[PDB]
Amino acid sequence: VKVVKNKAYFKRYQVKYRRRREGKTDYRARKALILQDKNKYNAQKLRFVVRKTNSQVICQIACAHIEGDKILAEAKSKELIRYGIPVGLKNYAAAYATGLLCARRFLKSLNLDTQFLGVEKVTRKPIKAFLDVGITRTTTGNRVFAALKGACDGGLNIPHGNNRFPGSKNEFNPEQLRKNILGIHVAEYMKTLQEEDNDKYKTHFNDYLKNNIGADDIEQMYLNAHEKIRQNPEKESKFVSKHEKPKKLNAKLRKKRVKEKLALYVE
C-alpha cells in the first residue's frame, strides 16, 4: 500500500491558526464582532464574553486592541461562596448570579453604579456590549442566556431576542424564566427523586445534604445572594512545586549519547 504521508506530503502542508487548531476560536464570528465603521473611528465596541467550563462559569468584558485585547471586568462562579451560596455552581441560577456580579463590578469601577440602578428583585444612555458565546450551540434554555439576563438586570444594555429563554420556543413565558432563575427546577428534582429510589437521592445530592441545604430553602438563598451582591461588588482585598520539569539538551551532549549507545551495542 502506497504510504500517503510522504516527504512531499509534509513539504506542501499549510497549517491553520493555533487557536483554530486547538478548537477554541471561531475567527469568522470574531471578526464580524470586532469590526466597526471605518469613518466612525475612536469607538471600540466592547463585547461580553461568557464561557462555561466544567464545574464553573466565567464572564468578562473585552476591548480588542491591536497587540492583544484588554479585560475591564471579570467574575468567576466560585466567588459565590463568599456571597452565601455553597456547592451548586454550574446551575442556571449560578450563571445568572455570575452575570450580575460582572455588571455590578464593572459599573463601580467607572463610578456609574449610583446612576444606573438596573432592576430590583427579580420579576444617560446605558453602556452597550455584544454577546460573545464561543463554541457551544445556542438552543432554547442554554445557560449563556441566563448570564445575559443577569448582566441586563445590572446597568448594562445587551441586545437580544426573547425566543431562546427556557420554554419559549414559540411563546415567551416570563414565569418559566423566573423559576429557572431561582432554582425551582433543581428543588423539584430533589422532591421527585425522594419519593422513589430514595438511595439514589442520597447519592446524587450528596453535597446538598452535607452542606445543610434542603429542597425547601433553595429560592431564599438566591434571593439573599442577589441583595448581598448588589450591596458590595468590589473584589475582595512563591509556590513550592515539589515536582520539577525536565530541561532540554544541546548538540554536544546528544553526540555522546550516540557514542554510548553504539558502544553498548558493539559487544
Binding site: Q14, Y27, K31, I34, D37, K38, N39
Partner: protein, 156 residues
C-alpha cells in the same frame, strides 16, 4: 477575435503565494485611516467584493473619502502625453497603510531636538543629509607575514 475583459491577463498577479492561502487575519480589521494619508493598493483575491482593477495593483495614493467599509484613493496614470488623476473606490481588505513616508517623519522628529539643543547653546547646526563622498587618508598597519601573493591560474 480580441478578448479584453476586466480580469484578463491576471493569472499570476491575482494568485496566492505558496502555503499562504486563506482569508485575512482579524487584526487587519483594526487599522486606522485618516484623510490625506498615503496608502498602498494591493489586491487580495480571497475577497471578491470591491476588487481594484489590474493597472492599480501596487500603486500609491492619497485618501479622499472614507465610508462604512470603503476608501477612495487618488492615483496618477499616464495617458499618452499627460498624467490623469483617477478616483479609485475599493473595499477595505485591499488597502494597506503606506510605509513610503516614515524616514521623513523620523527625520523631522529627531532633528527637532538637535535644533532645540543647538539654539539653547547658541551653536551652528547643519541638519541637511550628506551624500556619500570621497574617503580621507589613513595609516594601515600590516605585518609582512600576512600578505599573500597571487597570480593567474592555468587552464584545466
Amino acid at each position: 477575435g480580441k478578448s479584453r475583459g476586466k480580469r484578463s491577463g491576471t493569472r499570476y498577479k491575482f494568485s496566492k503565494k505558496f502555503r499562504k492561502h486563506g482569508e485575512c487575519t482579524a487584526n487587519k480589521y483594526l487599522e486606522k485611516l485618516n484623510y490625506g494619508d498615503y496608502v498602498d493598493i494591493v489586491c487580495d483575491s480571497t475577497q471578491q467584493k470591491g476588487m481594484p482593477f489590474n493597472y492599480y495593483h501596487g500603486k500609491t495614493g492619497k485618501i479622499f473619502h472614507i465610508t462604512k467599509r470603503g476608501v477612495g484613493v487618488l492615483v496618477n496614470k499616464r495617458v499618452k502625453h499627460r498624467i490623469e488623476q483617477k478616483k479609485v473606490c475599493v473595499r477595505i481588505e485591499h488597502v494597506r497603510k503606506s510605509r513610503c513616508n516614515e524616514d521623513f517623519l523620523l527625520r523631522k522628529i529627531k532633528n527637532a531636538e538637535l535644533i532645540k539643543e543647538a539654539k539653547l547653546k547658541n551653536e551652528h547646526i547643519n541638519i541637511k543629509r550628506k551624500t556619500e563622498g570621497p574617503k580621507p587618508a589613513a595609516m594601515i598597519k600590516v605585518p609582512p607575514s600576512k600578505i599573500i601573493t597571487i597570480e593567474p591560474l592555468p587552464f584545466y
